[PDB]
Structures are given as structure tokens and as C-alpha cells.
Design a protein around this nucleic acid. Structure first.
Ligand SMILES: [Ca+2]
Ligand SMILES: [Ca+2]
Length: 293
DNA sequence: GGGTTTCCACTTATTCACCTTTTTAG
DNA sequence: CCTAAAAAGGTGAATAAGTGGAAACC
């Protein structure tokens, strides 16, 4: 099929990226050439998602990104109009909305060909200073007279379950937890999570009310921090999580892990997880999920 | 035809996904 | 006692984000 547009924006909120290149250049009149676009890089196993997007928007080029990943890149200027038309109708809701807004300001600058005149590049740099990781060291030297306005924090709520399915297609984990505990000796526990940096803590907190279950767990690694929304109560997983993605279909290989997750759920609901044979079946499903596929 | 646009190969750091065991709740 | 639910603990890598070089093109 071709990707539902709210799924697509949810996936883009999770995996997308806007780019603005401002390249030192001797062959350009202004001394710099530019390139603007939107891009997605995934593991090779989900090349299909990217092809589905390419054919859904009917723009963008696909290339390998190393030997284990592949990317969809859209920088052909005329084709950016399809990106904008899509994100005006179906807007992002994470902080990435801020990066989209800058992409859009840079689009105007180039639509008027202002990116050739010296003043035109000065505005692209001003814009670029607050996009993603901002200006390179080399760029701050070329333009130390730059002062750019502070960037508003985005705070937007989940628009609907389609957005959620696309976002969960990016950030979610459907997990079968096997706990030592032993007379049978293995408690089967389903876990659902969604992972996201603290910068979108508001959206992450809203998930408890949006889905009617779960809890936020704060996580750390070196100096970095982020958040998990987690559900571990079987009834909530069986009555609240599973129907949402049944009605609102995941994409990529992660749909297969969801489908296996649902097989284990059916077995827990039938108490087969408390029998030896059912336990064995669950181990086999777990074996071939996620990293084991 | 040559200044600019587009494309394609390729790289890098950390926010994701995914994993295990222990402890507490019921 | 027994089973479920949550907490405690951990990290490899698929992401986000970016770069070099050059052919395609107006
Ligand atoms: Ca993300
Ligand atoms: Ca993902």
C-alpha cells in the first residue's frame, strides 16, 4: 500500500531529519553553494518503508548509507514543495517541528533565489544556526557577526492514533520478558515501551493519559538522559495497547515483532504461559523477535 | 558552457530500541 | 505459597545528522 499521511508524519517525527548545507565554494558566485532537503536513514531491513514513502510522495532519491543502512534524501528544490505541502497539512508535533519551520524559512530564501546574493546567504546561516546541531566552527568564523533569535520550545499534543502508529513504528519496542522465579521457573511478562529524549518530556508524559496506562521511567548513559514510556500490566497491554495498533497498523519490520508480540499475548490470556508447552512456544517466539529475527 | 543544482558515496555520535535480573505488589 | 507488576541495571547500534566529490543540468 502507500503510507497513510499521519503515519508518515509520525514516522518522520521519530526518524526524519531536515538538512541545510552551506558549503564553502570557490566555483559559486557568492562563495557558497547551498542544498536544502529532508531525509530518513534506516537500517537496510526497512528499505521498503523508504521506497513506500518515495512512491507515496513521488519525490526523493534512495541511496545506500554504508553497508548496513540506506537513506531517502529529498533535496531537488521543486520537490521540496511536496514536503511542505505534506507538513502544512499533517504537522509534526515534536521539537522537530522547530527544525521544519527553519527548513521552511530557508525554502523561501531560495525560492526567491536570494541564496545567490551575499545578503541571501547571511540569512540562510542565521536560519541554519538554530537548525539541528547548528553552525559548524568553520561557519561561525565566516560569520562571527551573526546573532540569531532564540528558538521557541515546541509543545504540541498527539493529533490521533495514526500519528502514534507512525511514531511507534520508529521509537517503540514490543518485548517478551522472561523472568527467573522456581517451579516452571519462568514468569512471562509482556513489555511495551516508547523511547525519547527529555526534550519532549511533555509529549512523553501525555502518553499516560492518551493511552490510559503506563509510567515514565527516566534513563541515563554517560552524561546523556532520556525517557521511556512503559506498560507492563497485561490487561492494559491486552486491552489498551494491542487494539490501538490493530486499528492503526505499524510499518517496517517492527510490524512483524508486533504480530509475534500479539501471539504471546493470546497465549497469556489463555493461561498457556503457565504450562510447560506454552512456555516453550513463547521462548521460540521470543527467540525470533527483534534482534533475533 | 559554466555557475548552480542534484545526485551518490560515505562518515560520525548518541538517542534510541532492546536486553537481563531483582525486588515489590497483589 | 504463587503469579503479576514494577524497579533496578545495562549497552550495541540504527538512527539523526552531517560531509566530500562530482556529474547533471539550466
Ligand atoms: Ca527519534
Ligand atoms: Ca526506529
Amino acid at each position: 500500500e502507500s503510507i497513510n499521511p499521519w503515519i508518515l508524519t509520525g514516522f518522520a517525527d521519530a526518524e526524519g531529519s531536515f538538512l541545510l548545507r552551506i558549503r564553502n565554494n570557490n566555483k559559486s558566485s557568492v562563495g557558497y553553494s547551498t542544498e536544502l532537503g529532508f531525509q530518513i536513514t534506516l537500517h537496510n531491513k526497512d528499505k521498503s518503508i523508504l521506497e513506500n514513502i518515495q512512491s507515496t510522495w513521488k519525490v526523493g532519491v534512495i541511496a545506500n548509507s554504508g553497508d548496513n543502512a540506506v537513506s531517502l534524501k529529498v533535496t531537488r528544490f521543486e520537490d521540496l514543495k511536496v514536503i511542505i505541502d505534506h507538513f502544512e497539512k499533517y504537522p509534526l508535533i515534536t521539537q522537530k517541528l522547530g527544525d521544519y519551520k527553519l527548513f521552511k524559512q530557508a525554502f523561501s530564501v531560495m525560492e526567491n533565489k536570494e541564496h545567490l546574493k551575499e545578503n541571501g546567504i547571511k540569512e540562510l546561516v542565521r536560519i541554519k544556526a538554530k537548525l539541528n546541531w547548528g553552525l559548524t566552527d568553520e561557519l561561525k568564523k565566516a560569520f562571527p557577526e551573526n546573532i540569531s533569535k532564540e528558538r521557541s520550545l515546541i509543545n504540541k499534543n498527539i493529533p490521533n492514533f495514526k500519528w502514534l502508529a507512525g511514531f511507534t513504528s520508529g521509537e517503540g519496542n514490543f518485548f517478551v520478558n522472561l523472568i527467573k522465579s522456581s517451579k516452571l521457573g519462568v514468569q512471562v511478562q509482556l513489555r511495551f515501551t516508547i523511547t525519547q529524549h527529555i526534550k519532549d518530556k511533555n509529549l512523553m508524559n501525555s502518553l499516560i493519559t492518551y493511552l490510559g496506562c503506563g509510567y515514565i521511567t527516566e534513563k541515563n548513559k554517560s552524561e546523556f538522559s532520556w525517557l521511556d514510556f512503559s506498560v507492563t500490566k497485561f490487561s492494559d497491554i491486552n486491552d489498551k495497547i494491542i487494539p490501538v495498533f490493530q486499528e492503526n497498523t505499524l510499518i517496517g519490520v517492527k510490524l512483524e515483532d508486533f504480530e509475534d508480540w500479539c501471539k504471546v499475548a493470546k497465549l497469556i490470556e489463555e493461561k498457556k504461559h503457565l504450562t510447560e508447552s506454552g512456555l516453550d512456544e513463547i521462548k521460540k517466539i521470543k527467540l525470533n523477535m527483534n534482534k533475533g529475527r
